[PDB]
């Protein structure tokens, strides 16, 4: 089955005049005139090429001519890359362990609700003029309000002033598996930076013991399946800042996912996979900026967090990169899926049920505050 349809494709041109097949006179064509003519023969114009370059009407060369056209097709990854399997694909591409439970230090750092409820109600109903808002409206608003609520505790911890939450921040990182080349790209949300690096959660004992278990395969599905295959990518890594910039080390990737429609969302499993991939890429970029580009085992492992999206459902991911040589030891990540703060909200009164959220739990806010603290 050939997809195309002859009627939709470009119509085949008419047959050349029988006068050109005579070797070799001058076929009297209408080239002398500047308009279509029915009688007389049809000429064969040459391929015209514009002398000057017009940005409004500029044609790019083909793929066979480029400055860095490589033969090894590297598969890049971005926010739009919707995975297929789920978290297992991200774990295989990153080579890290999956722990179903947050660390002990973060949970212990915890040791109020009216403010959170008011902020939720505001962002969900009162933050706009019209009724029944949309995800694209209250998702970034919810994220910003939560960040502000978490940062308002600077009076208690004076060390929370040495950080900032930027917006348009990107990153890049390249690594090999067995043995193709991969690549990642920046995000499209927020990003919290810190002056000093985060502390090491897991010790070297766990890093050495992780050599026992292995990765989880998924035959016959390949780790690419959904990753974007794109040539001409430039392997030269890059970050979102330049040398000598305050607050260089990251802390928590506050990426969001707008989209008012369900099909335009990223799903929980695929969103967690994308978050893990982004955290691994940021950690690798930070390691390459601190150390060299050689493949070896790092001595001072870094830590990069990330929070889920969606005003209702929420996810947590605490990455911990300790080795740059993939191809040995591996990393470990702590996940907390399907946390979801408040179950449902009733913008209008149904006829029975008041105007407000239902099914709220404070553990989500406590975990958010603990993740925001960590270093303070």
């Amino acid at each position: 089955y050939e997809w195309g349809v002859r009627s939709t494709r470009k119509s085949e041109p008419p047959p050349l005049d029988r006068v050109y097949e005579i070797p070799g006179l001058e076929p009297i064509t209408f080239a002398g005139k500047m308009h279509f003519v029915p009688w007389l023969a049809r000429p064969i114009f040459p391929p015209w090429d514009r002398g000057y370059k017009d940005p409004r009407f500029y044609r790019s060369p083909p793929l066979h001519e480029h400055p860095l056209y490589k033969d090894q097709a590297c598969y890049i990854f971005h926010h739009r890359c919707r995975l297929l399997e789920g978290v297992k694909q991200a774990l295989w591409l990153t080579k890290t362990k999956l722990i179903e439970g947050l660390p002990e230090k973060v949970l212990s750092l915890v040791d109020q609700d009216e403010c959170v409820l008011n902020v939720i109600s505001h962002a969900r109903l009162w933050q706009t003029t019209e009724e029944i808002p949309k995800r694209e409206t209250y998702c970034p608003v919810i994220v910003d309000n939560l960040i502000q609520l978490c940062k308002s505790q600077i009076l208690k911890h004076p060390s929370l002033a040495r950080r900032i939450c930027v917006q348009n921040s990107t990153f890049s990182a390249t690594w090999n598996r067995e043995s193709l080349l991969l690549q990642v790209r920046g995000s499209g949300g927020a990003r919290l930076s810190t002056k000093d690096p985060l502390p090491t959660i897991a010790s070297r004992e766990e890093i050495e013991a992780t050599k026992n278990h292995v990765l989880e395969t998924f035959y016959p599905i390949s780790p690419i399946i959904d990753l974007h295959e794109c040539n001409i990518y430039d392997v030269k890594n890059d970050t979102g800042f330049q040398e000598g910039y305050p607050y260089p080390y990251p802390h928590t990737l506050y990426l969001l996912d707008k989209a008012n429609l369900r099909p335009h969302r990223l799903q929980p499993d695929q969103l967690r996979a994308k978050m893990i991939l982004f955290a691994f890429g940021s950690a690798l970029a930070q390691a390459r900026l601190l150390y060299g580009n050689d493949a070896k085992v790092l001595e001072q492992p870094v830590v990069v967090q990330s929070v889920g999206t969606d005003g209702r459902v929420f996810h947590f991911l605490v990455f911990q990169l300790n080795t740059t040589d993939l191809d040995g030891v591996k990393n470990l990540a702590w996940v907390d899926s399907d946390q979801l703060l408040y179950q449902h909200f009733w913008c209008l009164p149904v006829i029975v049920e008041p105007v407000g959220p239902v099914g709220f739990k404070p553990e989500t806010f406590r975990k958010f505050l603990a993740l925001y603290l960590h270093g303070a």
Partner: protein
């Protein structure tokens, strides 16, 4: 049908027209870590933040002016929390529309089937600030109720339709930052920013060099008036039921380098002729000239930085609500 008032306008000498439509009183003047943080926030978007896509002149105010201002406001709110505890529990809305509706004066139909009938012309300000702060409690009064200040108000001896200000019909909205069912209804400071249209370079290219500060003054006046009117209507007050207490407000404007501050003091809400013949009160709106925050930036280093602007920003953000 009501005149669609735009705070960010480009008309000439629109300050007098706005003062007449609002009945205000303008008055010139006012009633180490922070500097480093501001310089870092600047240099960030000015050089450090590697832009994937090449930014042009039209995509500058929307990619380097808004994020930098947002980061500056966030850093200020975070650093001023210990000294100002009222800012910790404050609600900050990033990019939220501000609407307000009111009536002013009368107007007889010139031609049509409605000729010979009094039609009170209406107005509406649909401001869209970049980010504002909200506090449950109200700000102090600064200026007492009912002030003399003998400076008169512009007259405007012509139809208001002459100035590029046309009429349009749509849903009348009176919105501050949230709905009436919210405790965080009051605020204090407000931030704005003009687009590539109202650029001082564009005004210098033409001959409207004297309108540079006038545009900022009119925008600040419109924003403050809309804010105060909407927040007073949220409390139940309106034309007939005049406000019993003043609704002071503050707003800061800029364009990318020059900064200036403006104050306000809402005194009355009855702008119609039915309650203006015996209304000796009037609103006030303080202001200052535009000063440059920094001369230029070389690669990754400020040149002539200014500390007075930062000091004024700190003084404006540290005002505690009584």
């Amino acid at each position: 049908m009501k005149y669609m008032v735009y705070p960010q306008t480009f008309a000439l000498n629109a300050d007098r027209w706005y003062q007449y439509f609002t009945k205000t009183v303008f008055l010139s003047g006012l009633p180490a870590a922070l500097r480093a943080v501001a310089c870092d926030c600047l240099l960030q978007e000015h050089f450090y933040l590697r832009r994937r896509r090449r930014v042009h002149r039209y995509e500058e105010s929307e990619v380097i002016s808004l994020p930098f201002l947002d980061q500056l406001v966030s850093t200020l709110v975070g650093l001023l929390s210990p000294h100002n505890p009222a800012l910790a529990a404050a609600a900050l809305d990033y990019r939220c529309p501000v609407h307000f509706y009111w009536v002013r004066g009368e107007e007889i139909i010139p031609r049509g089937h409605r000729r010979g009938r009094i039609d009170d012309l209406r107005y509406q300000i649909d401001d869209k600030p970049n980010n504002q702060i909200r506090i449950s409690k109200q700000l102090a009064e600064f200026v007492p109720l009912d002030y003399s200040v003998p400076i008169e108000i512009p007259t405007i001896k012509c139809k208001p339709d002459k100035l590029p200000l046309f009429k349009r019909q749509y849903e009348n909205h009176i919105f501050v930052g949230s709905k009436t069912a919210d405790p965080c209804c009051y605020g204090h400071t407000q931030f704005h920013l003009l687009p590539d249209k109202l650029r001082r370079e564009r005004l210098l290219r033409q001959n409207c060099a004297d309108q540079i500060e006038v545009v900022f003054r009119a925008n600040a006046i419109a924003s403050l008036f809309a804010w105060t009117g909407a927040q007073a209507m949220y409390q139940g007050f309106w034309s007939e039921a005049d406000v019993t207490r003043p609704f002071v407000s503050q707003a800061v404007i800029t364009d990318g380098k020059y900064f200036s501050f403006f104050c306000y003091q809402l005194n009355t809400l009855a702008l119609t002729t039915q309650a203006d013949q015996n209304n000796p009160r009037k609103n006030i709106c303080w202001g200052t000239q535009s000063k440059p925050l920094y001369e230029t930036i070389e690669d990754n280093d400020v040149k002539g930085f200014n500390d007075d602007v930062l000091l004024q920003i700190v003084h404006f953000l540290l005002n505690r609500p009584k």
